[PDB]
Amino acid sequence: PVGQFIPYSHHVTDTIISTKNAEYLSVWKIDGRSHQSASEADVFQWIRELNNTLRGISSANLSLWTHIVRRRVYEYPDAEFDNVFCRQLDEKYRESFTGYNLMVNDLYLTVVYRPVPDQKKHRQESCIKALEDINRTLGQSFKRYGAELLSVYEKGGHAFSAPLEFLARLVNGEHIPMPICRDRFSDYMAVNRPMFSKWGEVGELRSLTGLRRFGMLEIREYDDATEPGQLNVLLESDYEFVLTHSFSVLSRPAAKEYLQRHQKNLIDARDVATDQIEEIDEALNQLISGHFVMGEHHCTLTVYGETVQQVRDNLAHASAAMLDVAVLPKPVDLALEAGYWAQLPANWQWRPRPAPITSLNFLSFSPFHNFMSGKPTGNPWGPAVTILKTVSGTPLYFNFHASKEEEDATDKRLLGNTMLIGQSSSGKTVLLGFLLAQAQKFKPTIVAFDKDRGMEISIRAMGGRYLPLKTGEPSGFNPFQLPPTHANLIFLKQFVKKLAGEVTHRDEEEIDQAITAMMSDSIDKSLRRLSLLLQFLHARLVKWCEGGDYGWLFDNPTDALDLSTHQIYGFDITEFLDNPEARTPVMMYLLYRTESMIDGRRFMYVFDEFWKPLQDEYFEDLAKNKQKTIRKQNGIFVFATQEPSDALESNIAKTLIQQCATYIFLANPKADYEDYTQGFKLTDSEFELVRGLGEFSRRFLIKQGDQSALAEMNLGKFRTIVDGETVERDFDDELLVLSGTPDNAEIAESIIAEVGDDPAVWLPIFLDRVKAERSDVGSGSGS
Amino acid sequence: PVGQFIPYSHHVTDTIISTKNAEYLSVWKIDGRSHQSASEADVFQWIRELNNTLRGISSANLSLWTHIVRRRVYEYPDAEFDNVFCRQLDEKYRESFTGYNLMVNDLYLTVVYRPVPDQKKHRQESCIKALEDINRTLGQSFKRYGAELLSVYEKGGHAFSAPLEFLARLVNGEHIPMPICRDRFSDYMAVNRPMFSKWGEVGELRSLTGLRRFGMLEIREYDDATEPGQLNVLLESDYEFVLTHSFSVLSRPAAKEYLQRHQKNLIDARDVATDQIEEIDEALNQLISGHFVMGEHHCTLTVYGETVQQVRDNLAHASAAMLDVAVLPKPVDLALEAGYWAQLPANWQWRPRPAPITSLNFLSFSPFHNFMSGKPTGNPWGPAVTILKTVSGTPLYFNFHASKEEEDATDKRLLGNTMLIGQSSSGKTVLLGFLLAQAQKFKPTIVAFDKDRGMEISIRAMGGRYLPLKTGEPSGFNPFQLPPTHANLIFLKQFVKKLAAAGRDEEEIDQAITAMMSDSIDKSLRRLSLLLQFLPNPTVHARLVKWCEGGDYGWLFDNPTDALDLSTHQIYGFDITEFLDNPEARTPVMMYLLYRTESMIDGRRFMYVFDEFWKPLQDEYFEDLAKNKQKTIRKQNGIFVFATQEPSDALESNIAKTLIQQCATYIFLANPKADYEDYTQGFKLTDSEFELVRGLGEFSRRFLIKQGDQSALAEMNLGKFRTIVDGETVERDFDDELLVLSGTPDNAEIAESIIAEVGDDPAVWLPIFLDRVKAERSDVGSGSGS
């Protein structure tokens, strides 16, 4: 049958998996350091640190199985928006990938402990303690690597097994979420059994997504040298394959005996003393000195597909890309019937060929892969944008919340803050408008604070509120002046930031309590109450000058209910570089209102030049306490500053950098310098990349946690429906997200003054008309 | 398994590999000598020179194994052009090759020294010295044979050891690049494992690319009367075969004793086969003097294919083609298995029948005769173009980077200068355009100096500039001379070459003119106008103004700048049509053009193109800068290609003879005139190659291509149609012979139309205007006048 060939039986604890041969397993899901944004000394230092780690995690009680699974992305739920602009953008982006081969490649590392009644239970508990020590040391040496211990999807429904299903994805060919029952896992739990041909050419695998066929390659006689990332040319890899590097650790005297027999072979060659006995004696010296640790090893690449000519084509391309880098893959005959059963990490019996390798040549073969999202689908929301063009590589799946320095991981969901920095108008607002437009698939309510009349047409076409501020016109927000919790506290803050220990600090709290007790008795009084509050018990200055603050509650009604009608809200903080005269009270009560509003969804506070308005100590107290409370309770801050080396002088910017998850560096030219390496936590290669992309390349360095790569937008794509359609250029709905100020501002104002409700169906029609007039007559006629 | 049948062990030195029985191999690749160019009686002289070499290194430790491998060439890449006209020409030429005679054959020779603890190391260190001596001898003897000693290939990505890959090709069936590693080669070479069954079955070879089958033919006859090319009739056939000849040298007592045994059985005892007893006595005295060397020799023909009826058909067709040359093949039974392991050059065990033959009957059965075929890959650039219609169908794979007897040091990549010889432009311009398009395949920086408005449509459609430079139109000023880069020396040389024509060393006077000209820093047309309006204050500004003629339209001086894409292109062209000396017109404009285009690109693909190359290079400055420019530009990846209309007029000069001496690929087009003591003296042909060039004809564009020491005829043949395609609606080719051939009244009107009638940078105005050329000239042009 099939159940005798798969050795697992979960009977111990969360991370450890027992079996019938009394072995124990523990699976890690890693997404390692990117192999595109680092120097050669950095990857050499990484391999040296990993070898110094694995030198202690040794001594014959260990088997490490590194799996590199390149898999299609069937789990991605591309869905609808229920507004026509964002659905049009999703349609253009989804069919803007003309054969991009959307595959993601995750890593796994299986740690297997094998030692060689109540005493057997004691030995089992000793293996549990020993493997927990191994897992603790491995997690302490994988802090840069993003290695989540994979006993993490527990208690979903009725006790689902997370160190399982990866051991199903090897054996079934599809990620089936395994249930834990009081039974054995080898009975009939692994459902989709594969079958083999009688000659052993290509095996078949009857999954639920369709019948597949697979072929394998075994690596033998690899090169005597070892590049650190030597076999990373199989990550582009149009294969949907599974790579398995098994290293079962041999002890020191067993490895010394193996080199003794190898020297006996190389010295008793029939009159060919090939002078190769000078590096194996050096290897014996490194073994006795303790610099190495050797063990048995086999590498199997199982490439999947269908229509066996295509499987053989993939096998031939894999053999070509392997022999390019000086390893020799032999194909497999009927021993493939054992080789797939050598895929599982409890398979010393059906092991194809145990080549003894040193640990440096094992870490040099599986060091780790390029950059993707560690959770493509599975975030606290859905995946925001399937960003293409990690440059010559996989997709991105850009998320606002990925990871951070994982200390005290409990009592928090995930840090979600992002810093979308870049040079002034060099491709910042188009990316921010695109991300805020694409994020609407799981219903957030974004609140934006602009730089200078930017992102206007995007938020206005999304259905947003977007009041544009001018401070002279009476159309503006009014002081609401009715919280029945700490009206005295907000009267204190209003008095001190209206006079602008402010000036003398003499009994202003008595003025606040007097105006509260004389005016508010108790609830639901109108502009009579607001007029008493404005008049008597900005303040003295506008009271004696009559000019400069018309936009506040100066015979303006209580516009306080306007935070349940729309979803996107937008305020222009353009003419407010004169803080703390005007910018900090306005944003003080705006952030007061919009922080009293928390609707449970992702409240995305979008800032443009966040260091400009937040220049008061009240916003420092908010950037401590409110930032902790909002990044706790399903809130997301999206900053976009422009001059970060001019922003780094304030400590508010420092404490907002230190609590920010994902960074985007867009178009920083050579005018900026080595201060990206300190504060922003970069290496030298990442700053070299962001300075070497140039000025008008419109691609950005994305960095999440300890991973970094590049990303583009690719606004040139076309599709083929039956014959090859026209080139779309992604230029329809591109001037609406770029937000050129005069055309979009004038036409948006005039056609919200022409048709009443804010349209997604009628605003871009005449917006397209008024943009096409300029873009056709002004740019084609005169030459 | 198979690891006991394939006898190889580790590399011992750079070029010598080992065996599990302590034999030492060294693999040469022999780009063999071209035999269908001189095959009257010099073939016997080549065979006698090779036998006089092989008698020197007789050395009964030795065993030679030579392999003729016909391979269906797959490594020639598809040519992505990123153009429209040149891509159309590449598509038309690629569909022009349905001529099924692909399969380049390459010839290898493995020298196997078989030497019959620390003493074993001494044995190895003596066998290395002996095989290095034999390698030096065979290198000095195969100098004209295009030899290359296959070394350990020190950078593929780490180290890739490539005499081993050919040793893989005998056992695997494809060029598998075998990486050198910490394991003997007997355990990991045989990737594609063979299979054999029983009586009535040919061998199977289950490769990853597809299933293959193979049969074997064994040479077993008592034939003596051999010719030096008796088995090159298979060198044009289509089997994808591997033909192995093995010759292990018999020792002198064993050779004399077995020759005594065979002569007792043959030339004596009352039958004697009269009269075959005469050669044996003098040959026995020659063997006691060593003039013969007898050796165990066998030969197998492994014929590859698929669909075993087709393998049996190819075996029967090879049987007929070898029965044509009085050789009797035999099919191989179950000993095919052993016979397949008879191909690897360390197996004296699995040999079919080690019958002894002499050295001349081994060097005559398998000499290094080869149809000329260039490198498909491996050249430092991309391969240029394949051209068929050579000696018996096999393709050529033309390449500029072909070796020579020069390069005493291996400093540059490969010598790559080329020149065409032909009279009256008899289809020269079409060949130069057809080479320029397939050179535009791998993006070069072409600079051309055309003769009389030729190559103008090809350059203009290829993304070129093509200054007309003519003293006859209402326009014409295209020269600037304004910014100085090598100011004092080069503009001093240009001034003294512009004014110095009086019959007297005005060098310091011109130096003071340049010193008063440079006023002061970074000046424009104001500075050039100051240079024009400097006072006379003898050889003076008078002849300068009167030999620019005043309002210098055809001339170089008194111009504005023409700064428009002088460096941001890929193809530049100039004309020297109305340029002849007295007055000195052609030399300063050529000096200025070579000076400005010297430092165009230092490092990437550069190709100087010259038409009538002996015409501008006449003065002594051109000799000095030609020698220095060759010596410093051949290292900086700048190759040349010349073309002349007369051989004898080009051989009249001396610096032109120096440039002839340093070329690397000659293409002799067509000469019925054929002055005898110029082709064989200056351009270095033999007598039979010159007779070939004379008998080539006068209008057909069949040309003798000679590169290295190989020579073969070729025809580019852009006049051939086809018979089938996927879109079965049209199967004839007609175009692109009227755009590269570039008749000057067509090119003048194409330039006038691209200036005034339409206006376009790329080749997008072309095809209806090509109809406006062709159909309009055929209907209302030549035939119907008025």
Numbering used by the authors:
A (entry chain A): 15 to 130, 146 to 529, 533 to 569, 584 to 829
B (entry chain B): 15 to 130, 146 to 532, 538 to 571, 581 to 829
Sentences from the paper on this structure:
In Gram-negative bacteria, conjugation is mediated by a large transport apparatus—the conjugative type IV secretion system (T4SS)—produced by the donor cell and embedded in both its outer and inner membranes. The T4SS also elaborates a long extracellular filament—the conjugative pilus—that is essential for DNA transfer. Here we present a single-particle cryo-EM structure of a T4SS complex from the R388 plasmid that comprises all four sub-complexes: OMCC, stalk, arches and IMC. Three ATPases, VirB4 (also known as TrwK), VirB11 (also known as TrwD) and VirD4, power the system.
We first solved the structure of VirB4 in its unbound form (VirB4unbound) and fitted and rebuilt the structure within the IMC density. The dimer interface between VirB4central and VirB4outside is mediated entirely by the N-terminal domains of each subunit.
